[PDB]
Design an enzyme around this catalytic site. Structure first.
Site, PDB file in Angstrom:
ATOM      1  NE  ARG A 121      -3.865  -0.408   2.286  1.00  0.00           N
ATOM      2  CZ  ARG A 121      -5.057  -0.539   2.874  1.00  0.00           C
ATOM      3  NH1 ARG A 121      -5.208  -1.329   3.936  1.00  0.00           N
ATOM      4  NH2 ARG A 121      -6.108   0.115   2.395  1.00  0.00           N
ATOM      5  CG  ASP A 135      10.197   7.791  -3.172  1.00  0.00           C
ATOM      6  OD1 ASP A 135      10.573   8.137  -2.027  1.00  0.00           O
ATOM      7  OD2 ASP A 135       9.117   7.194  -3.379  1.00  0.00           O
TER       8      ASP A 135
HETATM    9  O1  K32 Z   1       4.360  -1.218  -3.346  1.00  0.00           O
HETATM   10  C1  K32 Z   1       4.931  -2.208  -3.945  1.00  0.00           C
HETATM   11  N1  K32 Z   1       5.174  -3.348  -3.287  1.00  0.00           N
HETATM   12  C2  K32 Z   1       5.762  -4.122  -4.213  1.00  0.00           C
HETATM   13  C3  K32 Z   1       6.246  -5.415  -4.153  1.00  0.00           C
HETATM   14 BR1  K32 Z   1       6.089  -6.335  -2.502  1.00  0.00          BR
HETATM   15  C4  K32 Z   1       6.835  -6.015  -5.268  1.00  0.00           C
HETATM   16 BR2  K32 Z   1       7.494  -7.775  -5.121  1.00  0.00          BR
HETATM   17  C5  K32 Z   1       6.954  -5.335  -6.478  1.00  0.00           C
HETATM   18 BR3  K32 Z   1       7.785  -6.161  -8.014  1.00  0.00          BR
HETATM   19  C6  K32 Z   1       6.447  -4.034  -6.513  1.00  0.00           C
HETATM   20 BR4  K32 Z   1       6.522  -3.040  -8.091  1.00  0.00          BR
HETATM   21  C7  K32 Z   1       5.854  -3.413  -5.416  1.00  0.00           C
HETATM   22  N2  K32 Z   1       5.315  -2.183  -5.240  1.00  0.00           N
END
Ligand code: K32
EC number: 2.7.11.1
Length: 325
Positions: free
Chosen positions: A41, A150
């Site tokens: 999130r 970021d």
């Molecule tokens: O906020 C998130 N959380 C997240 C995860 Br946990 C993975 Br494995 C990946 Br590949 C990506 Br793009 C994100 N954005």
């Protein structure tokens, strides 16, 4: 102020590389991708583990919260520009809801372990290994004319089993242009460089090396965030309470930056805490004269003194990592 390296990337490129509004998004099949479980999130999106129903491959489905079209074009062109390069999250597809037309961005799946969990388990070598993997992603995007803007541990996905690392969340990323004045309301608080905090707007790739350094100090010293400011002013104050205010004032004079009196007063006057005054029994094994020397060259008020991502990778700190490679 200009970047010391890669300053001209976007100028030599055809305008079509960096004109992200010139992009017409080619749209994909929303059905191809099914939500399996919630994984993350944030302010601008919800993130789900997914499945590609065509071929049964796992994927990451990132569903964006109602977002300005121009801001999605930027995140999308950056991702397409960087897809394939070292440790950059690969965009798989971009799909929209048919009824309300909200975007989901489809990514490669990474079996991530959250840093709050993973980081205290890491050996000295793994720390070095992973900072090096991240440095590859950074040198790469900087070479391609992008600042991530970021960098933080949340934006660094790590499958620890496969030793796989991906720099994710290019939502705040931006093309670099010489003498272009940027929004300082970027990055996340604890990883905001002095330049953002002091309103120096003509910043560059070096911003990412401060954030990197913050992230690196938190790992070796086991103080996360390393710089814990409550608001944008308490952030600079926490930097100054370590780096000394003497170092700040020369920096402020170099770029001719005056602080607001509300800021000046909160900052005050502080002597520098030596980096070795963060070493305790708990983190003792992650400190070495090289870890200190490398970190010291990251966290500098002056973004121009900061190591670039390519210099940082040659630091004797990474010696064993380059040797394995
Ligand atoms: O906020 C998130 N959380 C997240 C995860 Br946990 C993975 Br494995 C990946 Br590949 C990506 Br793009 C994100 N954005």
């Amino acid at each position: 102020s200009k970047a010391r390296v890669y300053a001209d990337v976007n100028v030599l490129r055809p305008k079509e590389y960096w004109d992200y509004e010139a992009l017409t998004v080619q749209w994909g099949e929303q059905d191809d991708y099914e939500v399996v479980r919630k994984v993350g999130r944030g302010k601008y999106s919800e993130v789900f583990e997914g499945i590609n129903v065509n071929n049964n491959e796992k994927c990451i489905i990132k569903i964006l919260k109602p977002v300005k079209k121009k801001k999605i074009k930027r995140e999308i062109k950056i991702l397409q520009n960087l897809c394939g390069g070292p440790n950059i999250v690969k965009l798989l597809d971009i799909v929209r809801d048919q009824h309300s037309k909200t975007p989901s961005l489809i990514f490669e799946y990474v079996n991530n372990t959250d840093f709050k969990v993973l980081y205290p388990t890491l050996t000295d070598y793994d720390i070095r290994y992973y900072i090096y993997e991240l440095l590859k992603a950074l040198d790469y995007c900087h070479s391609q004319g992008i600042m991530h803007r970021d960098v933080k541990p949340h934006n660094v996905m790590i499958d620890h089993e496969l030793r796989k690392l991906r720099l994710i969340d290019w939502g705040l990323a931006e093309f670099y242009h010489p003498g272009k004045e940027y929004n300082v309301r970027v990055a996340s608080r604890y990883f905001k460089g002095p330049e953002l905090l002091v309103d120096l707007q003509d910043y560059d790739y070096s911003l990412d090396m401060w954030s990197l350094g913050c992230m690196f100090a938190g790992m070796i010293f086991r103080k996360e965030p390393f710089f814990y400011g409550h608001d944008n002013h308490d952030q600079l104050v926490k930097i100054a309470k370590v780096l000394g205010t003497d170092g700040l004032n020369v920096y402020l004079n170099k770029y001719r930056i005056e602080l607001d009196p509300q800021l000046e007063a909160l900052v005050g006057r502080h002597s520098r805490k030596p980096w070795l005054k963060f070493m305790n029994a708990d983190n003792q094994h992650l400190v070495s004269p090289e870890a200190i020397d490398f970190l010291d060259k990251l966290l500098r008020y002056d973004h121009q003194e900061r190591l670039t991502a390519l210099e940082a990778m040659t630091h004797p700190y990474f010696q064993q990592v380059r040797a394995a490679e």
